[PDB]
Every structure is written in C-alpha cells, then in structure tokens.
Amino acid sequence: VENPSLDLEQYAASYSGLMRIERLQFIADHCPTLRVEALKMALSFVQRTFNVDMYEEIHRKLSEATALDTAWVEATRKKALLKLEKLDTDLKNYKGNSIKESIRRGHDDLGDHYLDCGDLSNALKCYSRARDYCTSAKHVINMCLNVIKVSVYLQNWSHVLSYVSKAESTPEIAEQRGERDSQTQAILTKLKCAAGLAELAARKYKQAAKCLLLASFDHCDFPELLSPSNVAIYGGLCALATFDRQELQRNVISSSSFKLFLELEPQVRDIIFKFYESKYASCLKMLDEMKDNLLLDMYLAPHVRTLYTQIRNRALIQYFSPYVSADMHRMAAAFNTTVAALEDELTQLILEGLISARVDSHSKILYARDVDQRSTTFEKSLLMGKEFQRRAKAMMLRAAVLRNQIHVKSP
Amino acid sequence: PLIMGVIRECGGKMHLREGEFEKAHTDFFEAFKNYDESGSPRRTTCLKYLVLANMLMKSGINPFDSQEAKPYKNDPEILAMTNLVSAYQNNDITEFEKILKTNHSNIMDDPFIREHIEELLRNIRTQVLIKLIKPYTRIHIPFISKELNIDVADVESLLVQCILDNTIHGRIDQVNQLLELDHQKRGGARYTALDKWTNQLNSLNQAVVSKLA
Amino acid sequence: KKNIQRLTKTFLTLSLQDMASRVQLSGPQEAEKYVLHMIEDGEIFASINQKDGMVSFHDN
Structure with missing residues (x-):
C-alpha cells in the first residue's frame, strides 16, 4: 500500500487539540510505510499529553521488529502539578470571594487544565455539579458544549445524545425559527455535527446522514471535532447507503447547502452522481478505490463493510427496477462480477430482500415475477380456516378434560 | 454597496460558473431583471439569455408578450432565438435539431449556451x-x-x-x-x-x- | 427435500449437475431421482429434461 496522495501536513492542519494524537496513533498502527513523515511529525509534536509509556512500548516493539528522559518527565510533572496547585489556590480564593463570574472562570480553567493533562471523568463530574450554578444562556450553552466534547472524547455517545437534545430544546425551542438559518456564531451546526457523529457511532446511518446534511459551510472548520472533509464523507456515504431515490434527489443532489460541501471531496461527489445516473460499474470501481483510504479513518472504519454492503445491495435492487426481463451477462459486466457470483448474489437477494424475481440459468436471464392476488388470498384464507378448525377441536377437548378434572398427581 | 456589491457579484460569478440548481436559477432571474431595468442598450445580447431562461423555466411561456421586441426581432440577423422558442413550445425535435445545426456562429460558440443546451434538447425528447x-x-x-x-x-x-x-x-x-x-x-x-x-x-x-384456561 | 423445495423460490430452470451442488446430493443422477420421487409424491411442481439435463420449476 503505497499512498502519496495522503498529505500528513494538511491532515494534521485539519484538526487541533487532543483528537490529533489518537487519530495519528490510529493511522500509524493501522498503516505501515509512513516512516519519514511519521518520524518527522512525532519528533516535532509528540511532546503533548505527558504520556509516553505506551508510546515508548509501541516504538520499542517497532524497533525490535525492524527512551525515558527522567529529567524531562520530572520537569513536565513538576510544572503540571505546580500549575494545578496554583489553579486550586485561585479556585479557593474565588470561592472565598463568592463571585459567580470568578467561580465560572475557575471551572473553565480547571476544565482546560484537565483537558490538557488527560483527566476527563473528574472534569465531567465537576461540570455536572457546576451545571446548577450556571444560569445565563451563554454560560449553559458553553458548559453543554464542554460536556459534549468531553463525552465525545470518552466515547459515550448514548449519554451525550440527551445532552445535545436538551441543549437544542432549552433555548426557546431551538431559537424558534433558527435565527435566520443560524447567526454569525456556529453553535447549531456544532450541535448537529456532534449529534450526527453520535448517531453514526450508535449505528443509525439514516439519522447520522440527516444530522450531518444540515451542517453549513458558514461554520468554516471545527478543529476539535471532525473535519469538513470528514463530515462531507460521512454524510455522503450514509446518505447513499440509506436514502432512497426521492430522498437522495431532494436532500443531496438538489440541496444548495451540501454541494459546496462535496466540493472538498470530488471523489464522493462523482460517486453519488454516478450512482444517481445509473453508472454502476464506475461508481463501484471508484468506491473500491476509495475503500483503502476509508479504512484508516477513526469513526468510519467499523462501519465501512456494512455501508459498502448496503450501497451494493441498493445498486443491485435499483438496476433491476425498470426491467421485466434482464440479461445476466450485461448485469454481471455492469457490476464487475462474474455471472456465477452475480447468480449467487441474486439468489441471496431474492430469498429475503426486495428483489422479486426468478433466475433462469439456462439462458442466464432474470425474469420479474408478478404474483396474482386472487390465488394467494384463497390459499391463505383456506390455511387460516384449517388452523381455526384444528384449534377449536383442540380447545373443545381441553374444555372436556378441564370439566372432568383430569390431572397428574404426585404418586 | 461596498460589501453588498462584492458579495452579490461573487455569488453571481460562481453561480454562472457552476449553476447550483434553484438558487442559481433565482440569482439568474434577479440579475436578468436588474440588467433589463438598468442595462437597456445591452438587450441585443440579453435577449438570447432571456429566451434561454424562458425555456429553462418553461412556465411563463410568454416571451413574445413584449410588442416592442417584435420589430427588432423580425430583422433576419437575430432570429435563431425566436425560432428556437417556437420549436421548443411546439415540442418537435426535427425542427430544433435542423435549426441548431444549420444556424452558425450564433449558438454553438457561446459556452453559456452550450452548457445548458443539453437539458434543453433532452426536455423536448422526454415530452415527445x-x-x-x-x-x-x-x-x-x-x-x-x-x-x-x-x-x-x-x-x-x-x-x-x-x-x-x-x-x-x-x-x-x-x-x-x-x-x-x-x-x-x-x-x-x-x-x-x-x-x-x-x-x-x-x-x-x-x-x-x-x-x- | 426441504432444500430442493427452497430451490423453487428463486430459480426457474436449473441444471441437474449445478443443482446437485447446492443441496450436496453428489450426483446429477441422484438429483434427478430425488426430483422424480418428489414429483411423484406431489410435493413439488417441476419437469425434467434429459436432453439438456435441466429441471424446470413451474409452481403454478
């Protein structure tokens, strides 16, 4: 796997904050052959999070397959606990003065320091306790954003979904109209993106696509959360996999809010357009091309297989929609598979899914099957009558035995 | 209009380059109305764009309502737009194609007409x-x-x-x-x-x- | 027999050699005799073609 197109400089510049290190370690431990760029980036920026035990373990494993600076770690620990104690003293004197602004600033700096150091649970509990002491709308929205981000870091999306819903519903029913499709600040877009990411991680692709499609490019970039390219990719793939033709045309193809978003991903734009206009061979070919890069993502790697299977099944069902008698050779050519593989896939689809057809393996032709209602209703009604008569006879016998008091005793 | 003018002209230029469906369509109607109210001498080349927009919406179907345009249209130098409108409303493909290939140096050389002639030719075929x-x-x-x-x-x-x-x-x-x-x-x-x-x-x-039981 | 009956819910004409590979019957002759017995017993609606070695499912 030799990939020159994946530029680490822009990939790092797209994000900021804590998420950078987990993203880099994920791509590093799932993708070899990045020695020079990985070494340069690690040497220049590995100094954060003050956590190098697993890092040194992994690099020792890498070196043995193909250290601890006591003074540096002591200095980092010393200044970290020194500033922690200083923030404790500031919090103490602020709570002694008993000023709402002072204590709010105190919790803000404590949360920032906890985020920098790596402790999350204590910050989350502190913020939950401090929620009752926050009364302004701006302050409560800020604490909602903070709890959302720490929950996203901690990977508990079911718990954070309630927070997103409460933050959406609390301020005058989502600002009533929405403040002329959001105001200058991008807060509704952040809520929508967080909810979409949570829905995607919870395996609700339709909801994830519906949440991410409402994101507006006016938000520019969100370095803590997912990148604009990432939200474009997620909202394109989920929409392609779940939305039907009418919904896709109404919400993605024609909507004048997601096209400029897809302009960052020409590959995804071409994929969705070719799927819409029935160029299945090219669409599937470029999907298979993009799969290798997609597998190295963070929140989409588990769902790649399911999304691709759903997309391919949707394409197969939509190909046979206008036809009453299709030739399997052309279908196999258009789906980049042999006739035998296409026959097996068609059998699997006909057995359970939406395709109602019968294969003919002599001439290799798929014939649409039209079921007559009259015979089916007659058959089902006669079967129901037979079952009813049997049950009535059985319960008549049950009534007889119950009346006669027949039962099995211990001896 | 220092900020508004720059913003609106930028929106106009990427909407001309790309054409994002209905938003670009509404921008086009508003710009064409503005250039009709203010750019009076530019009608000589604006009429082609006007009739093109007329066949794109296919709802007004009244391009000949303005009686003042008829005397200038009857001049044989510029009649391809009018005969295109008449063929398009009549919904016949042969006349449209014959006029398009026969008429020269007026239609096929303009990118702003070439990029939208495909849907124009497809609509009549679909209706027929x-x-x-x-x-x-x-x-x-x-x-x-x-x-x-x-x-x-x-x-x-x-x-x-x-x-x-x-x-x-x-x-x-x-x-x-x-x-x-x-x-x-x-x-x-x-x-x-x-x-x-x-x-x-x-x-x-x-x-x-x-x-x- | 249940597998052979399930074969009628997807297929219209199936080669005997090909059919005796999804039901694991190990032989076109064995599959043909199975189909013949099932037709005789009235469990299935199908016909056999020996010239092409193909079973056609009617189910009407």
Missing part, C-alpha cells in the same frame, strides 16, 4: 416520448429510436431514467428489445380487504381460544 407512449401497450425500442432520432442505447437509457423517475409507467423487456406499459387495472381492493379480514380473524380466534 411521453406523448408517443400513450396509446401503445407493447412498443418496440427501435421504433422509439426512429422517432426520437437517437441510437438504441440512448433510448434505453432515457427509458430507464424516466421509469425510475415515475414519469413513464411501464417495464422494459431487454431480451426482445421492447417496453410494455401497464394499462390493465384489476380489482385488488377486494383481495386486500379479504387478506385483512383473514388476518383479523386469525388473531381473534387465537385470542378467544387462549381465553379458556
């Missing part, structure tokens, strides 16, 4: 196909190709696109290269009602039997 398909029950695809003056593959692609869009009610037989349109209607409501009655009877019988 829909009108043609009405009486027949099983109609050959080569016959449609002969009528619409396109190859067989183009006819099949157009039929597939129309059927998926629920504008043509029928299904294509690929082996025999035809399409069959559903014209017969049966009384399926009676059988649906019988199915519902059977299911309700089954559930009710199960509950009544299970009552005794």
Whole structure:
C-alpha cells in the first residue's frame, strides 16, 4: 500500500487539540510505510499529553521488529502539578470571594487544565455539579458544549445524545425559527455535527446522514471535532447507503447547502452522481478505490463493510427496477462480477430482500415475477380456516378434560 | 454597496460558473431583471439569455408578450432565438435539431449556451416520448429510436431514467428489445380487504381460544 | 427435500449437475431421482429434461 496522495501536513492542519494524537496513533498502527513523515511529525509534536509509556512500548516493539528522559518527565510533572496547585489556590480564593463570574472562570480553567493533562471523568463530574450554578444562556450553552466534547472524547455517545437534545430544546425551542438559518456564531451546526457523529457511532446511518446534511459551510472548520472533509464523507456515504431515490434527489443532489460541501471531496461527489445516473460499474470501481483510504479513518472504519454492503445491495435492487426481463451477462459486466457470483448474489437477494424475481440459468436471464392476488388470498384464507378448525377441536377437548378434572398427581 | 456589491457579484460569478440548481436559477432571474431595468442598450445580447431562461423555466411561456421586441426581432440577423422558442413550445425535435445545426456562429460558440443546451434538447425528447407512449401497450425500442432520432442505447437509457423517475409507467423487456406499459387495472381492493379480514380473524380466534384456561 | 423445495423460490430452470451442488446430493443422477420421487409424491411442481439435463420449476 503505497499512498502519496495522503498529505500528513494538511491532515494534521485539519484538526487541533487532543483528537490529533489518537487519530495519528490510529493511522500509524493501522498503516505501515509512513516512516519519514511519521518520524518527522512525532519528533516535532509528540511532546503533548505527558504520556509516553505506551508510546515508548509501541516504538520499542517497532524497533525490535525492524527512551525515558527522567529529567524531562520530572520537569513536565513538576510544572503540571505546580500549575494545578496554583489553579486550586485561585479556585479557593474565588470561592472565598463568592463571585459567580470568578467561580465560572475557575471551572473553565480547571476544565482546560484537565483537558490538557488527560483527566476527563473528574472534569465531567465537576461540570455536572457546576451545571446548577450556571444560569445565563451563554454560560449553559458553553458548559453543554464542554460536556459534549468531553463525552465525545470518552466515547459515550448514548449519554451525550440527551445532552445535545436538551441543549437544542432549552433555548426557546431551538431559537424558534433558527435565527435566520443560524447567526454569525456556529453553535447549531456544532450541535448537529456532534449529534450526527453520535448517531453514526450508535449505528443509525439514516439519522447520522440527516444530522450531518444540515451542517453549513458558514461554520468554516471545527478543529476539535471532525473535519469538513470528514463530515462531507460521512454524510455522503450514509446518505447513499440509506436514502432512497426521492430522498437522495431532494436532500443531496438538489440541496444548495451540501454541494459546496462535496466540493472538498470530488471523489464522493462523482460517486453519488454516478450512482444517481445509473453508472454502476464506475461508481463501484471508484468506491473500491476509495475503500483503502476509508479504512484508516477513526469513526468510519467499523462501519465501512456494512455501508459498502448496503450501497451494493441498493445498486443491485435499483438496476433491476425498470426491467421485466434482464440479461445476466450485461448485469454481471455492469457490476464487475462474474455471472456465477452475480447468480449467487441474486439468489441471496431474492430469498429475503426486495428483489422479486426468478433466475433462469439456462439462458442466464432474470425474469420479474408478478404474483396474482386472487390465488394467494384463497390459499391463505383456506390455511387460516384449517388452523381455526384444528384449534377449536383442540380447545373443545381441553374444555372436556378441564370439566372432568383430569390431572397428574404426585404418586 | 461596498460589501453588498462584492458579495452579490461573487455569488453571481460562481453561480454562472457552476449553476447550483434553484438558487442559481433565482440569482439568474434577479440579475436578468436588474440588467433589463438598468442595462437597456445591452438587450441585443440579453435577449438570447432571456429566451434561454424562458425555456429553462418553461412556465411563463410568454416571451413574445413584449410588442416592442417584435420589430427588432423580425430583422433576419437575430432570429435563431425566436425560432428556437417556437420549436421548443411546439415540442418537435426535427425542427430544433435542423435549426441548431444549420444556424452558425450564433449558438454553438457561446459556452453559456452550450452548457445548458443539453437539458434543453433532452426536455423536448422526454415530452415527445411521453406523448408517443400513450396509446401503445407493447412498443418496440427501435421504433422509439426512429422517432426520437437517437441510437438504441440512448433510448434505453432515457427509458430507464424516466421509469425510475415515475414519469413513464411501464417495464422494459431487454431480451426482445421492447417496453410494455401497464394499462390493465384489476380489482385488488377486494383481495386486500379479504387478506385483512383473514388476518383479523386469525388473531381473534387465537385470542378467544387462549381465553379458556 | 426441504432444500430442493427452497430451490423453487428463486430459480426457474436449473441444471441437474449445478443443482446437485447446492443441496450436496453428489450426483446429477441422484438429483434427478430425488426430483422424480418428489414429483411423484406431489410435493413439488417441476419437469425434467434429459436432453439438456435441466429441471424446470413451474409452481403454478
């Protein structure tokens, strides 16, 4: 796997904050052959999070397959606990003065320091306790954003979904109209993106696509959360996999809010357009091309297989929609598979899914099957009558035995 | 209008370059109305864009309402737009194609007309196909190709696109290269009602039997 | 027999050699005799073609 197109400089510049290190370690431990760029980036920026035990373990494993600076770690620990104690003293004197602004600033700096150091649970509990002491709308929205981000870091999306819903519903029913499709600040877009990411991680692709499609490019970039390219990719793939033709045309193809978003991903734009206009061979070919890069993502790697299977099944069902008698050779050519593989896939689809057809393996032709209602209703009604008569006879016998008091005793 | 003018001209320029559906369409109508109210001497080249927008919306269908434009239109130097409108409203492909290929140095050289001529040519073909398909029950695809003056593959692609869009009610037989349109209607409501009655009877019988214990 | 009956829910005409590979019957002759017995007993609606070695499922 030799990939020159994946530029680490822009990939790092797209994000900021804590998420950078987990993203880099994920791509590093799932993708070899990045020695020079990985070494340069690690040497220049590995100094954060003050956590190098697993890092040194992994690099020792890498070196043995193909250290601890006591003074540096002591200095980092010393200044970290020194500033922690200083923030404790500031919090103490602020709570002694008993000023709402002072204590709010105190919790803000404590949360920032906890985020920098790596402790999350204590910050989350502190913020939950401090929620009752926050009364302004701006302050409560800020604490909602903070709890959302720490929950996203901690990977508990079911718990954070309630927070997103409460933050959406609390301020005058989502600002009533929405403040002329959001105001200058991008807060509704952040809520929508967080909810979409949570829905995607919870395996609700339709909801994830519906949440991410409402994101507006006016938000520019969100370095803590997912990148604009990432939200474009997620909202394109989920929409392609779940939305039907009418919904896709109404919400993605024609909507004048997601096209400029897809302009960052020409590959995804071409994929969705070719799927819409029935160029299945090219669409599937470029999907298979993009799969290798997609597998190295963070929140989409588990769902790649399911999304691709759903997309391919949707394409197969939509190909046979206008036809009453299709030739399997052309279908196999258009789906980049042999006739035998296409026959097996068609059998699997006909057995359970939406395709109602019968294969003919002599001439290799798929014939649409039209079921007559009259015979089916007659058959089902006669079967129901037979079952009813049997049950009535059985319960008549049950009534007889119950009346006669027949039962099995211990001896 | 230091900020508003720059913002609106930028929106106009990327909407001309790309054309994001309805938003670009509304921007085009507003800009054309502005250039009609203010840019009076530019009508000589603005009329082509006006009639093009008229055939894109296909709702106003009154490009000849302005009686002042007729004396200047009857001049034979510029009549391709008018004969295109007349052919497009009449919904005939042969006249449109003959005028398009015969007329020179007026239409095919302008990128702002070339990029939108495809939908213009496809709309009349779609409408003619829909009108043609009405009486027949099983109609050959080569016959449609002969009528619409396109190859067989183009006819099949157009039929597939129309059927998926629920504008043509029928299904294509690929082996025999035809399409069959559903014209017969049966009384399926009676059988649906019988199915519902059977299911309700089954559930009710199960509950009544299970009552005794 | 249940597998052979399930074969009628997807297929219209199936080669005997090909059919005796999804039901694991190990032989076109064995599959043909199975189909013949099932037709005789009335469990299935099908016909056999020995010239092409193909079983056609009617189910009407």
